[PDB]
Amino acid sequence: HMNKSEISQVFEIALKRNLPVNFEVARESGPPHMKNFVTKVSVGEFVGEGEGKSKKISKKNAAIAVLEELKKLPPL
Amino acid sequence: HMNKSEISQVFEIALKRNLPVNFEVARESGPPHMKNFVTKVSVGEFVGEGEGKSKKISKKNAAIAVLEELKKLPPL
Amino acid sequence: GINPISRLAQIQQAKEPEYTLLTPRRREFVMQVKVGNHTAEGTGTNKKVAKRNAAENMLEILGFK
RNA sequence: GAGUGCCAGAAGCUGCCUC
RNA sequence: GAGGCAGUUUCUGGUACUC
């Protein structure tokens, strides 16, 4: 029915592998009516970063960027 | 485009009339399998209770109880 | 490998952690941890990251990550 | 009229744990 | 079936800063 948010995917892949996870908002830019956010996230050794007009968005784009670099590890 | 829940409603009414709100779960009662939750809420001088087989249910009912009394007031 | 605040909950099940909330142009939240043995603090831009920092600061005082 | 942050609340969905 | 923690989508109320 409803698809999984990339953020949620990341969180569960990392539980399956006991990798430490840490999303953080790097910084904010622009005036208040045109802010631009950036979130950098580490999944153990892998990293992604995203940008967006809101914190939600930038976080998602960061999750995406890491999912690309987590598709290379071996399965169970 | 979803409906307003009775629980959500109380908060809006109370905020307009500057009245304190507190939902609290009174207790769980009954045998381990038939446990029933009772929660009561206090909106100032008004009070209502509610009961349900889940917390969220009983909270909803408690909200319904006070909501009837808050229809007995002047809409000035 | 779990999320920091569930790990505290599922790490004190050997012997239930307790939280409370404390008091600029960039205002902040500060939340405390009470596990009996010691007490930790944590700050963030919203309530949500203030309770994840408060957790991962008591998993650091117990020596897990 | 608009944007973003923050607080509260509700419904849905996912994951893990306990009974 | 019930409870807890987390994640997330949508919606509601309020508020702050800015255009």
Residue numbers in the entry:
A (entry chain A), B (entry chain B): 180 to 255
C (entry chain C): 284 to 298, 302 to 309, 314 to 355
Task: Quote the original article.
Staufen proteins bind structured mRNA motifs through dsRNA-binding domains (dsRBD) and are involved in mRNA localization in Drosophila and mammals. Members of the Stau protein family share a common domain organization, consisting of four to five copies of the dsRNA-binding domain (dsRBD) separated by linkers that are predicted to be unstructured. Similarly, a stem of 19 bp is required for the binding of human Stau1 (hStau1) to the 3ʹUTR of ADP-Ribosylation Factor 1 (ARF1) mRNA. To understand how Stau recognizes its target RNAs, we determined the crystal structure of the minimal RNA-binding region of hStau1, consisting of dsRBDs 3 and 4, in complex with the 19 bp SBS from ARF1 mRNA.
